Amino acid sequence: THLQEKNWSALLTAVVIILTIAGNILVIMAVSLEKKLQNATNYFLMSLAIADMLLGFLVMPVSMLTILYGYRWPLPSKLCAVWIYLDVLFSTAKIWHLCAISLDRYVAIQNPIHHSRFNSRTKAFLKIIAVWTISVGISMPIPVFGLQDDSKVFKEGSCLLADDNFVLIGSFVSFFIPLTIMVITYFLTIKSLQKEAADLEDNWETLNDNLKVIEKADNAAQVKDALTKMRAAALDAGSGSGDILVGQIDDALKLANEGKVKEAQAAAEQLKTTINAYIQKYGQSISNEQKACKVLGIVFFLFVVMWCPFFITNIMAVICKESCNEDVIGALLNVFVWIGYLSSAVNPLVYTLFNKTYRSAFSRYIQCQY
Ligand SMILES: Cc1nc2n(c(=O)c1CCN1CCC(c3noc4cc(F)ccc34)CC1)CCCC2
Ligand SMILES: CC(C)CCC[C@@H](C)[C@H]1CC[C@H]2[C@@H]3CC=C4C[C@@H](O)CC[C@]4(C)[C@H]3CC[C@]12C
Ligand SMILES: [Zn+2]
């Protein structure tokens, strides 16, 4: 039966709604409770999850109500523009949250002391508020012109963004520009991390060369010279983390400055083991940045690929009003809108897959074990 089609569409819509709300609430709880997940990127991801939850709680159920009424808007006229504004607001906020994550992490890894433990919570919160304000500013044209003009938000009785200029400018400002920025920033990030690993290997090379020089030293002058080169290398290798290693090298360097050559050589001998350990630690930190980069790239790819069919079909239907068939186009737009909405529910599953802390948190939350 063809009414069974409406029943199935509404049912699958409800499935997507419940999945979105539940998963993003799980992400909210994970970021709100775990102190192991309290850096800037996780604050951005929790803001992202609340945005997706607001989308799945205020916008997607109204879309289900719309698809139940034969796509005829049953609510008051102003609520159509309000609902389109909220929809565009939350989706634009999501994509620009992703863009801000990419850019912020890139700018961070640019800073030569970005491995220090001192990160400010308030700065990340201010960035999140700035992104939400950007989203509100991008979405304001719909309330401005939509409440003034009933025709720009209504399309044959149906509550759709009918202005072609609005559609194209919103596709560019809200989807295409942040997508391109995301791609560029991601590839620049992989290049910067490669540079980081290369510099770390160079620091290790310097450390080994000067340890070997110290092992065969004769007088205090060359001991101090090799220890100075070692101190520079070790300070560079920490990427601002801040450890005992440079302090131990300074202890050996004091021994060298006093003229004690044998004791300085013994100190360098202990430093050899300490240096191997710390170098491996720094390499592991770089590898962790690489893994986080790839996971966030998976997130970006899933979101963009799931929203791409809708934007493709929408811009195409704006271009060809009669060249292309519009019944199949309307069916495609329905299906692709709901795929893009499914993108909002996909994220917590991805957090579960490639993150052990998120997965443990969710496994303990399903059983209510806090
Ligand atoms: C409910 C509905 N139902 C129908 N149609 C609709 O367009 C709609 C509106 C669908 N909104 C979903 C979010 C979109 C969006 N805005 O900004 C973004 C930025 C992003 F990164 C990703 C996505 C977006 C804009 C449209 C037309 C066919 C008939 C049924
Ligand atoms: C705790 C941290 C990490 C997240 C903070 C999220 C804050 C900044 C977000 C969450 C929900 C957001 C609000 C959701 C909806 C609207 C309606 C819009 O027309 C004006 C902005 C406004 C009022 C948003 C302001 C920013 C907001 C309050
Ligand atoms: Zn780093």
Tab-separated table of C-alpha atoms and ligand atoms in Angstrom:
chain	number	residue	atom	x	y	z
A	1	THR	CA	0.000	0.000	0.000
A	2	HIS	CA	1.142	3.564	-0.723
A	3	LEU	CA	0.082	4.718	2.756
A	4	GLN	CA	2.445	2.070	4.121
A	5	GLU	CA	5.127	4.198	2.454
A	6	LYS	CA	4.248	7.139	4.700
A	7	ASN	CA	4.189	4.829	7.709
A	8	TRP	CA	7.649	3.455	6.870
A	9	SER	CA	9.107	6.904	6.212
A	10	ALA	CA	7.808	8.184	9.549
A	11	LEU	CA	9.031	5.056	11.363
A	12	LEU	CA	12.572	5.223	9.961
A	13	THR	CA	12.561	8.948	10.732
A	14	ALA	CA	11.694	8.139	14.351
A	15	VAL	CA	14.517	5.579	14.426
A	16	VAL	CA	17.005	8.226	13.273
A	17	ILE	CA	15.607	10.736	15.790
A	18	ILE	CA	15.939	8.359	18.746
A	19	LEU	CA	19.449	7.324	17.693
A	20	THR	CA	20.547	10.958	17.324
A	21	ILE	CA	19.178	12.043	20.700
A	22	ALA	CA	20.479	9.024	22.621
A	23	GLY	CA	23.961	8.981	21.092
A	24	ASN	CA	24.528	12.703	21.459
A	25	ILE	CA	23.296	12.599	25.065
A	26	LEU	CA	25.841	9.830	25.670
A	27	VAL	CA	28.569	12.041	24.180
A	28	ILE	CA	27.396	14.954	26.347
A	29	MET	CA	27.603	12.782	29.466
A	30	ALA	CA	31.045	11.473	28.496
A	31	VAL	CA	32.504	14.952	28.039
A	32	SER	CA	30.709	16.329	31.115
A	33	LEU	CA	31.829	13.598	33.530
A	34	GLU	CA	35.248	12.329	32.395
A	35	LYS	CA	38.193	14.587	33.239
A	36	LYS	CA	40.294	12.521	30.811
A	37	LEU	CA	38.250	14.167	28.022
A	38	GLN	CA	38.552	17.841	29.030
A	39	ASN	CA	40.691	19.536	26.401
A	40	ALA	CA	39.543	22.063	23.793
A	41	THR	CA	38.711	19.502	21.096
A	42	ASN	CA	36.424	17.577	23.454
A	43	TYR	CA	34.624	20.772	24.487
A	44	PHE	CA	34.059	21.458	20.787
A	45	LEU	CA	32.819	17.891	20.272
A	46	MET	CA	30.376	18.183	23.178
A	47	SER	CA	29.041	21.470	21.806
A	48	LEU	CA	28.718	19.601	18.505
A	49	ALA	CA	26.770	16.825	20.232
A	50	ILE	CA	24.376	19.264	21.906
A	51	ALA	CA	23.867	20.951	18.522
A	52	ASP	CA	22.989	17.589	16.972
A	53	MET	CA	20.693	16.840	19.921
A	54	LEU	CA	18.882	20.155	19.418
A	55	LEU	CA	18.572	19.303	15.722
A	56	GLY	CA	17.122	15.869	16.508
A	57	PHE	CA	14.785	17.196	19.211
A	58	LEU	CA	13.445	20.474	17.761
A	59	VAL	CA	13.832	20.115	13.969
A	60	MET	CA	13.744	16.446	12.947
A	61	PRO	CA	10.453	15.617	14.776
A	62	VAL	CA	8.828	18.638	13.132
A	63	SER	CA	10.080	17.273	9.805
A	64	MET	CA	8.393	13.977	10.702
A	65	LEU	CA	5.169	15.852	11.450
A	66	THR	CA	5.553	17.500	8.035
A	67	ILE	CA	6.034	14.193	6.201
A	68	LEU	CA	2.943	12.896	8.022
A	69	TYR	CA	0.814	15.804	6.725
A	70	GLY	CA	1.708	15.190	3.078
A	71	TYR	CA	4.478	17.817	3.328
A	72	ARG	CA	1.873	20.508	4.086
A	73	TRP	CA	2.844	22.849	6.917
A	74	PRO	CA	0.264	22.339	9.715
A	75	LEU	CA	1.594	24.909	12.214
A	76	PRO	CA	1.305	28.719	12.165
A	77	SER	CA	3.033	30.625	9.386
A	78	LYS	CA	5.769	32.280	11.468
A	79	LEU	CA	6.820	28.905	12.880
A	80	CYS	CA	7.829	27.816	9.365
A	81	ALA	CA	10.492	30.524	9.129
A	82	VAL	CA	11.465	29.923	12.767
A	83	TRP	CA	11.902	26.198	12.087
A	84	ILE	CA	13.940	26.733	8.910
A	85	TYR	CA	16.123	29.168	10.863
A	86	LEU	CA	16.710	26.665	13.665
A	87	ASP	CA	17.456	23.875	11.166
A	88	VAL	CA	20.006	25.894	9.184
A	89	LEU	CA	21.421	27.261	12.449
A	90	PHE	CA	22.128	23.861	13.983
A	91	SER	CA	23.534	22.330	10.789
A	92	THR	CA	25.776	25.331	10.066
A	93	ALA	CA	26.899	25.324	13.702
A	94	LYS	CA	27.853	21.659	13.345
A	95	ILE	CA	29.922	22.100	10.190
A	96	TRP	CA	31.626	25.220	11.537
A	97	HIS	CA	32.350	23.390	14.792
A	98	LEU	CA	34.195	20.827	12.669
A	99	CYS	CA	36.003	23.613	10.794
A	100	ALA	CA	36.962	25.355	14.046
A	101	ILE	CA	38.262	22.060	15.447
A	102	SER	CA	40.481	21.548	12.405
A	103	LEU	CA	41.819	25.118	12.365
A	104	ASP	CA	42.318	25.297	16.141
A	105	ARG	CA	44.233	22.011	16.283
A	106	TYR	CA	46.397	23.098	13.340
A	107	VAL	CA	47.223	26.486	14.886
A	108	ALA	CA	47.902	24.657	18.161
A	109	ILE	CA	50.401	22.189	16.682
A	110	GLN	CA	52.092	25.197	15.086
A	111	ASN	CA	53.002	26.511	18.568
A	112	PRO	CA	56.428	25.083	19.561
A	113	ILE	CA	55.316	24.508	23.178
A	114	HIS	CA	51.963	22.911	22.328
A	115	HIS	CA	52.848	19.778	24.325
A	116	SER	CA	52.756	21.687	27.623
A	117	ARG	CA	50.183	20.676	30.217
A	118	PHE	CA	48.864	24.259	30.517
A	119	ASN	CA	45.660	24.524	28.458
A	120	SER	CA	42.977	27.098	29.240
A	121	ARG	CA	39.340	26.002	29.484
A	122	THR	CA	37.983	29.557	29.205
A	123	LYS	CA	39.674	30.196	25.851
A	124	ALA	CA	38.106	27.075	24.329
A	125	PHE	CA	34.719	28.106	25.729
A	126	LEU	CA	35.088	31.564	24.172
A	127	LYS	CA	35.942	29.976	20.814
A	128	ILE	CA	32.833	27.779	21.040
A	129	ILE	CA	30.668	30.817	21.810
A	130	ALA	CA	32.225	32.622	18.841
A	131	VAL	CA	31.340	29.713	16.552
A	132	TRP	CA	27.736	29.659	17.786
A	133	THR	CA	27.529	33.416	17.174
A	134	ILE	CA	28.896	32.903	13.647
A	135	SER	CA	26.173	30.317	13.049
A	136	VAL	CA	23.443	32.664	14.299
A	137	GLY	CA	24.780	35.419	12.050
A	138	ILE	CA	24.812	33.157	8.997
A	139	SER	CA	21.260	31.985	9.724
A	140	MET	CA	19.733	35.418	10.478
A	141	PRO	CA	18.631	36.174	6.848
A	142	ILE	CA	15.906	33.511	7.135
A	143	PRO	CA	14.131	35.140	10.126
A	144	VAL	CA	14.726	38.623	8.705
A	145	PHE	CA	13.286	38.080	5.219
A	146	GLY	CA	11.173	35.013	6.055
A	147	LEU	CA	8.856	36.662	8.567
A	148	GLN	CA	8.669	39.816	6.440
A	149	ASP	CA	7.849	37.773	3.316
A	150	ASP	CA	5.707	34.632	3.360
A	151	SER	CA	6.841	33.586	-0.128
A	152	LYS	CA	10.558	33.114	0.608
A	153	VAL	CA	9.809	30.394	3.198
A	154	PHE	CA	6.769	28.718	1.593
A	155	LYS	CA	6.813	26.578	-1.557
A	156	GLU	CA	3.338	25.498	-2.743
A	157	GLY	CA	1.938	25.207	0.769
A	158	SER	CA	5.012	23.287	1.897
A	159	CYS	CA	7.453	24.889	4.340
A	160	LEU	CA	10.625	25.014	2.246
A	161	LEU	CA	13.362	27.583	1.686
A	162	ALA	CA	12.139	28.629	-1.759
A	163	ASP	CA	14.479	31.559	-2.477
A	164	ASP	CA	17.049	30.449	-5.053
A	165	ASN	CA	19.578	33.112	-4.055
A	166	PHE	CA	19.242	32.089	-0.409
A	167	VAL	CA	19.698	28.426	-1.362
A	168	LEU	CA	22.883	29.034	-3.353
A	169	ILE	CA	24.458	31.537	-0.949
A	170	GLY	CA	23.674	29.206	1.952
A	171	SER	CA	25.141	26.212	0.142
A	172	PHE	CA	28.338	28.213	-0.314
A	173	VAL	CA	28.640	29.977	3.055
A	174	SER	CA	27.302	27.136	5.214
A	175	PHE	CA	28.624	24.069	3.361
A	176	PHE	CA	31.251	24.669	0.671
A	177	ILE	CA	33.550	27.207	2.345
A	178	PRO	CA	33.958	25.303	5.659
A	179	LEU	CA	34.378	22.057	3.700
A	180	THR	CA	37.259	23.461	1.645
A	181	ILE	CA	38.835	25.031	4.739
A	182	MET	CA	38.544	21.658	6.494
A	183	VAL	CA	40.230	19.765	3.644
A	184	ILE	CA	43.095	22.256	3.333
A	185	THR	CA	43.644	22.372	7.100
A	186	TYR	CA	43.608	18.566	7.367
A	187	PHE	CA	46.310	18.069	4.749
A	188	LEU	CA	48.367	20.919	6.207
A	189	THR	CA	48.028	19.173	9.582
A	190	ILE	CA	49.419	15.901	8.242
A	191	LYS	CA	52.356	17.828	6.764
A	192	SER	CA	53.001	19.683	10.035
A	193	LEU	CA	52.955	16.443	12.036
A	194	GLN	CA	55.419	14.909	9.571
A	195	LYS	CA	57.658	17.944	10.138
A	196	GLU	CA	57.310	17.409	13.899
A	197	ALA	CA	58.417	13.774	13.653
A	198	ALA	CA	61.371	14.727	11.440
A	199	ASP	CA	62.522	17.375	13.920
A	200	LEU	CA	62.237	14.881	16.779
A	201	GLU	CA	64.422	12.386	14.907
A	202	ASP	CA	66.947	15.176	14.298
A	203	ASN	CA	66.995	15.967	18.024
A	204	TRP	CA	67.615	12.296	18.806
A	205	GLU	CA	70.478	12.220	16.291
A	206	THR	CA	72.083	15.241	17.957
A	207	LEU	CA	71.650	13.642	21.388
A	208	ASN	CA	73.342	10.403	20.312
A	209	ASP	CA	76.197	12.198	18.538
A	210	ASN	CA	76.990	14.266	21.609
A	211	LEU	CA	76.578	11.336	24.023
A	212	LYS	CA	79.178	9.477	21.962
A	213	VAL	CA	81.417	12.563	21.982
A	214	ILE	CA	81.131	12.729	25.784
A	215	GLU	CA	81.969	9.028	26.119
A	216	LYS	CA	85.378	9.658	24.490
A	217	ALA	CA	86.054	13.126	25.906
A	218	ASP	CA	89.379	14.244	27.387
A	219	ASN	CA	88.870	17.700	28.932
A	220	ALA	CA	85.948	19.650	30.360
A	221	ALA	CA	85.607	22.063	27.420
A	222	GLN	CA	84.354	19.516	24.888
A	223	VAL	CA	82.265	17.857	27.611
A	224	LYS	CA	80.495	21.190	28.095
A	225	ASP	CA	80.179	21.679	24.329
A	226	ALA	CA	78.563	18.281	23.757
A	227	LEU	CA	76.325	18.782	26.802
A	228	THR	CA	75.259	22.189	25.455
A	229	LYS	CA	74.300	20.680	22.102
A	230	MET	CA	72.494	17.901	23.994
A	231	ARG	CA	70.606	20.437	26.112
A	232	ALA	CA	69.477	22.336	23.014
A	233	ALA	CA	68.344	19.107	21.337
A	234	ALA	CA	66.482	17.892	24.436
A	235	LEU	CA	64.777	21.256	24.948
A	236	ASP	CA	63.616	21.198	21.323
A	237	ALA	CA	62.430	17.582	21.546
A	238	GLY	CA	60.051	18.200	24.447
A	239	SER	CA	57.899	20.541	22.323
A	240	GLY	CA	57.358	22.531	25.503
A	241	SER	CA	56.077	19.578	27.545
A	242	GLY	CA	58.379	20.421	30.446
A	243	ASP	CA	60.258	17.541	32.031
A	244	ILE	CA	63.229	16.650	34.218
A	245	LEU	CA	65.476	15.766	31.250
A	246	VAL	CA	66.756	19.294	30.587
A	247	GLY	CA	67.282	19.626	34.344
A	248	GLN	CA	69.429	16.488	34.437
A	249	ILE	CA	71.413	17.766	31.456
A	250	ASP	CA	71.897	21.012	33.391
A	251	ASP	CA	73.146	19.034	36.401
A	252	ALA	CA	75.692	17.319	34.153
A	253	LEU	CA	76.491	20.733	32.660
A	254	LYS	CA	77.177	22.169	36.120
A	255	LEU	CA	79.493	19.231	36.798
A	256	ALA	CA	81.238	20.063	33.514
A	257	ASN	CA	81.480	23.786	34.335
A	258	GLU	CA	83.144	22.983	37.667
A	259	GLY	CA	85.773	20.998	35.739
A	260	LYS	CA	84.749	17.513	36.930
A	261	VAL	CA	85.104	15.459	33.751
A	262	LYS	CA	84.688	11.903	35.075
A	263	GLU	CA	81.541	12.746	37.049
A	264	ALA	CA	80.093	14.609	34.057
A	265	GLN	CA	80.696	11.528	31.906
A	266	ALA	CA	78.896	9.322	34.448
A	267	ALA	CA	75.979	11.774	34.529
A	268	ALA	CA	75.832	11.584	30.729
A	269	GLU	CA	75.826	7.785	30.993
A	270	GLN	CA	72.645	7.885	33.094
A	271	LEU	CA	71.289	10.571	30.756
A	272	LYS	CA	71.615	8.076	27.892
A	273	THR	CA	68.858	5.837	29.293
A	274	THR	CA	66.766	8.813	30.405
A	275	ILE	CA	67.035	10.310	26.901
A	276	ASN	CA	65.995	7.108	25.141
A	277	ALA	CA	62.917	6.930	27.379
A	278	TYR	CA	61.901	10.569	26.895
A	279	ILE	CA	62.477	10.447	23.124
A	280	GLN	CA	60.155	7.450	22.875
A	281	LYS	CA	57.592	9.358	24.958
A	282	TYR	CA	57.730	12.344	22.589
A	283	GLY	CA	57.343	10.076	19.566
A	284	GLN	CA	54.300	8.490	21.194
A	285	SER	CA	52.824	11.961	21.731
A	286	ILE	CA	53.283	12.749	18.031
A	287	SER	CA	51.674	9.417	17.112
A	288	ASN	CA	48.711	10.247	19.357
A	289	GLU	CA	48.289	13.555	17.538
A	290	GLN	CA	48.362	11.609	14.262
A	291	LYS	CA	45.657	9.212	15.456
A	292	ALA	CA	43.434	12.063	16.648
A	293	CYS	CA	43.956	13.785	13.290
A	294	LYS	CA	42.858	10.677	11.390
A	295	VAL	CA	39.828	10.069	13.634
A	296	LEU	CA	38.640	13.657	13.235
A	297	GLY	CA	39.203	13.276	9.497
A	298	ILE	CA	36.906	10.246	9.546
A	299	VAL	CA	34.313	12.367	11.370
A	300	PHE	CA	34.640	15.175	8.810
A	301	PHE	CA	34.438	12.743	5.888
A	302	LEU	CA	31.338	10.980	7.205
A	303	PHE	CA	29.505	14.254	7.863
A	304	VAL	CA	30.396	15.821	4.506
A	305	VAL	CA	29.748	12.671	2.456
A	306	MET	CA	26.366	12.161	4.113
A	307	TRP	CA	25.307	15.766	3.489
A	308	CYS	CA	26.702	15.908	-0.071
A	309	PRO	CA	23.780	14.155	-1.858
A	310	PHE	CA	21.292	16.681	-0.466
A	311	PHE	CA	23.298	19.735	-1.529
A	312	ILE	CA	24.019	18.180	-4.939
A	313	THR	CA	20.337	17.486	-5.583
A	314	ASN	CA	19.242	20.865	-4.190
A	315	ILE	CA	21.607	22.975	-6.302
A	316	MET	CA	20.729	20.772	-9.280
A	317	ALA	CA	16.988	21.311	-8.753
A	318	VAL	CA	17.662	25.047	-8.490
A	319	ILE	CA	19.585	25.017	-11.781
A	320	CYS	CA	17.270	22.819	-13.885
A	321	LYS	CA	13.673	23.695	-13.050
A	322	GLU	CA	12.338	21.799	-16.093
A	323	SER	CA	15.335	20.068	-17.717
A	324	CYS	CA	15.598	17.467	-14.949
A	325	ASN	CA	12.676	15.413	-13.646
A	326	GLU	CA	11.331	16.862	-10.393
A	327	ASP	CA	9.245	13.974	-9.014
A	328	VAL	CA	12.304	11.745	-8.694
A	329	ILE	CA	14.130	14.903	-7.582
A	330	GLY	CA	11.669	15.419	-4.728
A	331	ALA	CA	12.018	11.786	-3.683
A	332	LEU	CA	15.811	12.172	-3.799
A	333	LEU	CA	15.630	15.344	-1.705
A	334	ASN	CA	13.539	13.577	0.947
A	335	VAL	CA	15.904	10.591	1.093
A	336	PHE	CA	19.011	12.790	1.139
A	337	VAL	CA	17.676	15.150	3.814
A	338	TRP	CA	17.176	12.091	5.990
A	339	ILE	CA	20.661	10.755	5.173
A	340	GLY	CA	22.099	14.109	6.230
A	341	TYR	CA	20.064	13.891	9.427
A	342	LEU	CA	21.460	10.382	10.000
A	343	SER	CA	24.914	11.973	9.864
A	344	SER	CA	24.066	13.676	13.174
A	345	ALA	CA	23.453	10.285	14.824
A	346	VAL	CA	26.530	8.655	13.268
A	347	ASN	CA	29.078	10.614	15.355
A	348	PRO	CA	28.786	8.829	18.758
A	349	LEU	CA	29.202	5.457	17.047
A	350	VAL	CA	32.448	6.775	15.540
A	351	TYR	CA	33.563	7.967	18.978
A	352	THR	CA	32.875	4.457	20.274
A	353	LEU	CA	34.783	2.757	17.450
A	354	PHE	CA	38.103	4.636	17.461
A	355	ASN	CA	38.325	5.764	21.104
A	356	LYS	CA	38.694	3.405	24.053
A	357	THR	CA	37.822	6.050	26.655
A	358	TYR	CA	34.556	6.985	24.925
A	359	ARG	CA	33.781	3.292	24.412
A	360	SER	CA	34.342	2.443	28.084
A	361	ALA	CA	32.260	5.459	29.119
A	362	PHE	CA	29.378	4.385	26.873
A	363	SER	CA	29.599	0.735	27.960
A	364	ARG	CA	29.346	1.871	31.583
A	365	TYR	CA	26.547	4.353	30.820
A	366	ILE	CA	24.266	1.829	29.099
A	367	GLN	CA	24.388	-0.223	32.316
A	368	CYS	CA	24.104	2.935	34.492
A	369	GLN	CA	27.454	2.521	36.278
A	370	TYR	CA	28.889	5.950	37.099
B	1	LIG	C1	13.077	19.183	6.658
B	1	LIG	C2	13.152	19.389	5.029
B	1	LIG	N1	12.233	18.629	4.164
B	1	LIG	C3	12.251	18.756	2.848
B	1	LIG	N2	13.123	19.604	2.088
B	1	LIG	C4	14.111	20.429	2.917
B	1	LIG	O1	14.886	21.178	2.336
B	1	LIG	C5	14.038	20.242	4.458
B	1	LIG	C6	15.081	21.113	5.224
B	1	LIG	C7	16.365	20.334	5.479
B	1	LIG	N3	17.421	21.238	6.051
B	1	LIG	C8	18.412	20.302	6.642
B	1	LIG	C9	19.771	20.951	6.953
B	1	LIG	C10	20.384	21.692	5.736
B	1	LIG	C11	21.664	22.510	6.011
B	1	LIG	N4	21.747	23.843	6.138
B	1	LIG	O2	23.027	24.220	6.383
B	1	LIG	C12	23.871	23.097	6.434
B	1	LIG	C13	25.286	22.982	6.665
B	1	LIG	C14	25.861	21.689	6.657
B	1	LIG	F1	27.152	21.519	6.860
B	1	LIG	C15	25.046	20.528	6.427
B	1	LIG	C16	23.672	20.686	6.209
B	1	LIG	C17	23.050	21.971	6.202
B	1	LIG	C18	19.338	22.647	5.135
B	1	LIG	C19	17.968	22.017	4.892
B	1	LIG	C20	13.078	19.693	0.500
B	1	LIG	C21	12.496	18.453	-0.211
B	1	LIG	C22	11.125	18.160	0.353
B	1	LIG	C23	11.216	17.900	1.870
B	2	LIG	C1	29.675	23.886	27.751
B	2	LIG	C2	30.226	24.354	26.409
B	2	LIG	C3	31.354	23.451	25.927
B	2	LIG	C4	29.121	24.444	25.364
B	2	LIG	C5	28.337	25.744	25.491
B	2	LIG	C6	27.225	25.771	24.450
B	2	LIG	C7	26.566	27.138	24.293
B	2	LIG	C8	27.618	28.196	23.978
B	2	LIG	C9	25.484	27.009	23.222
B	2	LIG	C10	24.631	25.778	23.525
B	2	LIG	C11	23.213	26.065	23.039
B	2	LIG	C12	23.371	27.388	22.310
B	2	LIG	C13	22.107	28.199	22.083
B	2	LIG	C14	21.109	27.356	21.305
B	2	LIG	C15	20.109	28.195	20.542
B	2	LIG	C16	20.181	29.530	20.407
B	2	LIG	C17	19.096	30.218	19.613
B	2	LIG	C18	19.733	31.201	18.643
B	2	LIG	O1	18.714	31.895	17.916
B	2	LIG	C19	20.553	32.189	19.458
B	2	LIG	C20	21.727	31.470	20.110
B	2	LIG	C21	21.286	30.343	21.042
B	2	LIG	C22	20.758	30.923	22.349
B	2	LIG	C23	22.492	29.454	21.314
B	2	LIG	C24	23.613	30.224	22.020
B	2	LIG	C25	24.848	29.355	22.269
B	2	LIG	C26	24.454	28.125	23.073
B	2	LIG	C27	23.949	28.532	24.453
B	3	ZN	ZN	52.666	17.936	18.788
